[PDB]
Amino acid sequence: TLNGGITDMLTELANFEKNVSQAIHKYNAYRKAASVIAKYPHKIKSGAEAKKLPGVGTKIAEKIDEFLATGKLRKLEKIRQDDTSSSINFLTRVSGIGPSAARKFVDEGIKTLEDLRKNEDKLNHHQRIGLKYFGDFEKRIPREEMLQMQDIVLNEVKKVDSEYIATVCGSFRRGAESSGDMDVLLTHPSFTSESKLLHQVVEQLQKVHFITDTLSKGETKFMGVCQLPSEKEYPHRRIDIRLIPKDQYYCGVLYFTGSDIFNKNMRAHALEKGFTINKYTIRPVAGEPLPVSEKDIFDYIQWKYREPKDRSE
DNA sequence: CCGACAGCGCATCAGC
DNA sequence: GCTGATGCGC
DNA sequence: GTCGG
Ligand SMILES: Nc1ccn([C@H]2C[C@H](O)[C@@H](COP(=O)(O)OP(=O)(O)OP(=O)(O)O)O2)c(=O)n1
Numbered sequence: 001t002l003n004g005g006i007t008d009m010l011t012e013l014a015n016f017e018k019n020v021s022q023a024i025h026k027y028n029a030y031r032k033a034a035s036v037i038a039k040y041p042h043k044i045k046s047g048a049e050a051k052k053l054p055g056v057g058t059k060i061a062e063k064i065d066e067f068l069a070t071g072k073l074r075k076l077e078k079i080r081q082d083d084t085s086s087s088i089n090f091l092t093r094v095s096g097i098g099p100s101a102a103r104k105f106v107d108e109g110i111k112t113l114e115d116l117r118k119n120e121d122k123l124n125h126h127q128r129i130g131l132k133y134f135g136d137f138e139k140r141i142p143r144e145e146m147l148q149m150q151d152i153v154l155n156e157v158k159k160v161d162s163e164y165i166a167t168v169c170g171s172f173r174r175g176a177e178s179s180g181d182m183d184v185l186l187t188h189p190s191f192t193s194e195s196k197l198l199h200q201v202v203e204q205l206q207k208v209h210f211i212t213d214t215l216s217k218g219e220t221k222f223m224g225v226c227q228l229p230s231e232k233e234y235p236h237r238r239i240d241i242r243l244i245p246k247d248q249y250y251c252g253v254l255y256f257t258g259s260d261i262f263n264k265n266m267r268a269h270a271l272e273k274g275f276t277i278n279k280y281t282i283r284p285v286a287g288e289p290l291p292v293s294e295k296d297i298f299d300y301i302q303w304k305y306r307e308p309k310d311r312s313e
Numbered sequence: 314c315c316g317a318c319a320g321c322g323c324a325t326c327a328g329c
Numbered sequence: 330g331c332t333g334a335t336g337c338g339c
Numbered sequence: 340g341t342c343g344g
């Protein structure tokens with residue numbers, strides 16, 4: 001709360017730019033400024049003081065000046081009381097409903113969850129699911145449940161074929177006490193960079209009633225919903241399964257471990273050290289992909305190997 | 314003044 | 330029928 | 340929106 005007023009303002013502005021203005025880069029810019037200010041071990045007294053921090057420019061400095069001089073931001077106060085802007089912003093909290101669909105819905109007088117429920121025919125499959133589990137999808141998953149979820153995935157995966165390898169990634173692998181969802185990386189000897197693997201795994205997870213719904217499903221990427229077996233019922237949870245080639249495991253596990261800001265900074269720094277890095281390979285006009293552990297990637301771009309727990313940014 | 318800020322996989326829409 | 334663009338969520 | 344070409 002040292003600079004909580006400021007960081008709250010910037011985060012709120014960020015969401016507006018993403019959900020209403022449809023400006024993801026302004027969203028990212030506001031998020032970046034909020035993040036650096038949250039690390040600043042001082043009580044900010046002026047916009048010029050905040051201006052010194054990387055990610056804080058002239059506009060945010062001006063906004064901070066107004067906030068420190070009035071206790072509020074007129075632009076934000078007006079946004080909050082705007083019915084269409086607030087409705088658009090809220091509807092995007094439904095999975096499957098982005099800035100475009102939210103705006104279209106609000107233009108049609110559809111502004112609430114109640115409105116969505118009585119207009120189900122106007123929703124696609126993904127949106128219907130996002131609406132059905134609206135509350136559950138905004139719940140956090142305690143690591144203990146993540147462990148129980150991991151146990152089921154790992155057990156059923158081997159039950160299909162012992163050659164499969166499944167690894168839970170993302171926040172869980174970064175050792176978070178709670179996660180927003182579950183991210184699973186899957187590999188098999190049959191699928192390499194040069195040469196129904198995902199389908200069989202998904203089918204088995206459905207057979208034991210772990211997976212309850214499907215948002216999207218192709219040959220390499222699954223997005224769906226899962227639930228632990230009950231005793232009170234556990235909330236439904238979001239789960240992704242990604243099938244990547246086995247000879248590209250290290251780049252894959254690195255990317256899906258994250259975090260998103262961390263990956264964003266790794267891509268940037270790689271570009272400086274004369275590298276380009278994706279979820280598949282890392283290349284030196286680019287060259288041929290290099291042989292790879294995770295530390296190897298850090299070594300190419302000249303970085304000390306940070307454990308997953310230190311990859312928040 | 315002005316473009317990058319990564320871009321992928323899947324569902325769905327737009328159009329031949 | 331198809332290819333490509335767009336929206337969406339990573 | 341900020342940064343840097
Ligand atoms: N815009 C994004 C979103 C995600 N990721 C990567 C890093 C993440 O770790 C991983 C999985 O995405 P999640 O949304 O699940 O993020 P987390 O698992 O890290 O956190 P959460 O607990 O909210 O699920 O994909 C990325 O590179 N860029």
Ligand SMILES: [Mg+2]
Pocket residue numbers: 170171179180181182183
């Ligand atoms: Mg996750």
Ligand code: NA
Pocket residue numbers: 050051052053054055056057
């Ligand atoms: Na600055």
Ligand code: NA
Pocket residue numbers: 091092093094095096097098
């Ligand atoms: Na949404």
Ligand code: NA
Pocket residue numbers: 170181182183240
């Ligand atoms: Na996820």
